[PDB]
Design an enzyme around this catalytic site. Structure first.
Site, PDB file in Angstrom:
ATOM      1  N   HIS A  36       0.810  -1.213   0.000  1.00 23.58           N
ATOM      2  CA  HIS A  36       0.000   0.000   0.000  1.00 23.58           C
ATOM      3  C   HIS A  36       0.842   1.261   0.000  1.00 23.58           C
ATOM      4  O   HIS A  36       0.341   2.313  -0.403  1.00 23.58           O
ATOM      5  CB  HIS A  36      -0.916   0.013   1.231  1.00 23.58           C
ATOM      6  CG  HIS A  36      -2.146   0.868   1.077  1.00 23.58           C
ATOM      7  ND1 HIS A  36      -3.123   0.625   0.125  1.00 23.58           N
ATOM      8  CD2 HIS A  36      -2.565   1.948   1.776  1.00 23.58           C
ATOM      9  CE1 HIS A  36      -4.082   1.530   0.242  1.00 23.58           C
ATOM     10  NE2 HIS A  36      -3.777   2.334   1.247  1.00 23.58           N
ATOM     11  N   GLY A 138      -1.042   5.337  11.477  1.00 22.15           N
ATOM     12  CA  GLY A 138       0.407   5.248  11.377  1.00 22.15           C
ATOM     13  C   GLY A 138       0.996   3.903  11.758  1.00 22.15           C
ATOM     14  O   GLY A 138       2.229   3.756  11.746  1.00 22.15           O
ATOM     15  N   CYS A 140       0.364   0.953  10.257  1.00 19.29           N
ATOM     16  CA  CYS A 140       0.476   0.048   9.111  1.00 19.29           C
ATOM     17  C   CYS A 140       1.897  -0.480   8.999  1.00 19.29           C
ATOM     18  O   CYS A 140       2.861   0.295   9.068  1.00 19.29           O
ATOM     19  CB  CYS A 140       0.090   0.794   7.833  1.00 19.29           C
ATOM     20  SG  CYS A 140      -0.146  -0.247   6.418  1.00 19.29           S
TER      21      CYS A 140
HETATM   22  C1  7YY Z   1      -6.915   3.644  12.831  1.00 18.46           C
HETATM   23  N1  7YY Z   1      -5.997   2.594  12.414  1.00 18.46           N
HETATM   24  C2  7YY Z   1      -5.695   1.440  13.032  1.00 18.46           C
HETATM   25  N2  7YY Z   1      -4.835   0.730  12.305  1.00 18.46           N
HETATM   26  C3  7YY Z   1      -4.624   1.547  11.233  1.00 18.46           C
HETATM   27  C4  7YY Z   1      -3.655   1.161  10.163  1.00 18.46           C
HETATM   28  N3  7YY Z   1      -3.609   2.012   8.967  1.00 18.46           N
HETATM   29  C5  7YY Z   1      -2.621   2.981   8.887  1.00 18.46           C
HETATM   30  O1  7YY Z   1      -1.765   3.129   9.742  1.00 18.46           O
HETATM   31  N4  7YY Z   1      -2.638   3.731   7.741  1.00 18.46           N
HETATM   32  C6  7YY Z   1      -3.544   3.635   6.702  1.00 18.46           C
HETATM   33  N5  7YY Z   1      -3.493   4.314   5.611  1.00 18.46           N
HETATM   34  C7  7YY Z   1      -2.416   5.203   5.396  1.00 18.46           C
HETATM   35  C8  7YY Z   1      -2.605   6.576   5.390  1.00 18.46           C
HETATM   36  C9  7YY Z   1      -1.503   7.428   5.179  1.00 18.46           C
HETATM   37  C10 7YY Z   1      -1.308   8.811   5.138  1.00 18.46           C
HETATM   38  N6  7YY Z   1       0.010   8.998   4.902  1.00 18.46           N
HETATM   39  C11 7YY Z   1       0.695  10.276   4.775  1.00 18.46           C
HETATM   40  N7  7YY Z   1       0.727   7.858   4.801  1.00 18.46           N
HETATM   41  C12 7YY Z   1      -0.192   6.886   4.976  1.00 18.46           C
HETATM   42  C13 7YY Z   1       0.005   5.486   4.928  1.00 18.46           C
HETATM   43  C14 7YY Z   1      -1.084   4.687   5.176  1.00 18.46           C
HETATM   44 CL1  7YY Z   1      -0.841   2.940   5.161  1.00 18.46          CL
HETATM   45  N8  7YY Z   1      -4.564   2.705   6.920  1.00 18.46           N
HETATM   46  C15 7YY Z   1      -5.587   2.499   5.890  1.00 18.46           C
HETATM   47  C16 7YY Z   1      -5.227   1.388   4.936  1.00 18.46           C
HETATM   48  C17 7YY Z   1      -3.985   0.756   4.923  1.00 18.46           C
HETATM   49  C18 7YY Z   1      -3.729  -0.262   4.022  1.00 18.46           C
HETATM   50  F1  7YY Z   1      -2.509  -0.846   3.993  1.00 18.46           F
HETATM   51  C19 7YY Z   1      -4.707  -0.676   3.121  1.00 18.46           C
HETATM   52  F2  7YY Z   1      -4.429  -1.664   2.251  1.00 18.46           F
HETATM   53  C20 7YY Z   1      -5.954  -0.067   3.107  1.00 18.46           C
HETATM   54  C21 7YY Z   1      -6.185   0.938   4.032  1.00 18.46           C
HETATM   55  F3  7YY Z   1      -7.407   1.519   4.056  1.00 18.46           F
HETATM   56  C22 7YY Z   1      -4.630   1.880   8.027  1.00 18.46           C
HETATM   57  O2  7YY Z   1      -5.528   1.057   8.160  1.00 18.46           O
HETATM   58  N9  7YY Z   1      -5.292   2.689  11.246  1.00 18.46           N
END
Ligand code: 7YY
EC number: 3.4.19.12
Length: 185
Positions: A36, A138, A140
């Protein structure tokens, strides 16, 4: 019952592609992270990962172990994980294996934010292949593991939180646990 996290803390890195950032696992000279990361914000909802992969070069990845940037010299995609080949082997690489766990098994999770370890806690995989973790934004790329004597068994890479507040991810070969896909929907 969480396992001591010292052997895994030394493996966590920050991976940035453009402005998208998450956590990576640095073992030997390979960094594993969720594919991702190659999505810009507009790609996140419905990514074509083969197309995005073609468009990136080694120099579009920024890998940071603490304050040290590691040079990416190769990259490839295996199911839902990206493998970045770096020019430096991790001197704190422990003995490790990759294993795929089953519902009912427990494991420890090292929650990380921007490549830095934040907490460790125990989880169990539910029969629908979700886990009730303690993950914030954050997180992920945070990893789950068990310790088998001297050997760290990595079993879980964190990808996403689902609408009901439980969590889903892959094994370290990039295969989801459960019927999920790595897209923001
Ligand atoms: C609330 N929560 C609990 N666990 C998670 C895990 N998670 C995460 O940390 N980040 C995500 N999206 C990103 C946004 C970004 C914005 N910037 C600047 N960089 C980013 C990198 C990421 Cl990965 N997500 C959402 C998400 C991550 C994926 F790997 C996926 F395949 C689908 C998704 F919807 C997330 O769930 N957040």
């Amino acid at each position: 019952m969480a396992f001591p996290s010292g052997k895994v803390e030394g493996c966590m890195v920050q991976v940035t592609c453009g402005t998208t950032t998450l956590n990576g696992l640095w073992l030997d000279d390979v960094v594993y992270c969720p594919r991702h990361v190659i999505c810009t914000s507009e790609d996140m909802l419905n990514p074509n990962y083969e197309d995005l992969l073609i468009r990136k070069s080694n120099h579009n990845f920024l890998v940071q172990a603490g304050n040290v940037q590691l040079r990416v010299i190769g990259h490839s995609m295996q199911n839902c994980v990206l493998k970045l080949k770096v020019d430096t082997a991790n001197p704190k690489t422990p003995k490790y294996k990759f294993v795929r766990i089953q519902p009912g098994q427990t494991f420890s999770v090292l929650a990380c934010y921007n490549g830095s370890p934040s907490g460790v806690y125990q989880c169990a995989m539910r029969p629908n292949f979700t886990i009730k973790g303690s993950f914030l934004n954050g997180s992920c790329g945070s990893v789950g593991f068990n310790i088998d004597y001297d050997c760290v068994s990595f079993c879980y890479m964190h990808h996403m939180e689902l609408p009901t507040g439980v969590h889903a991810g892959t094994d370290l070969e990039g295969n989801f646990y459960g019927p999920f896909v790595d897209r923001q929907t």
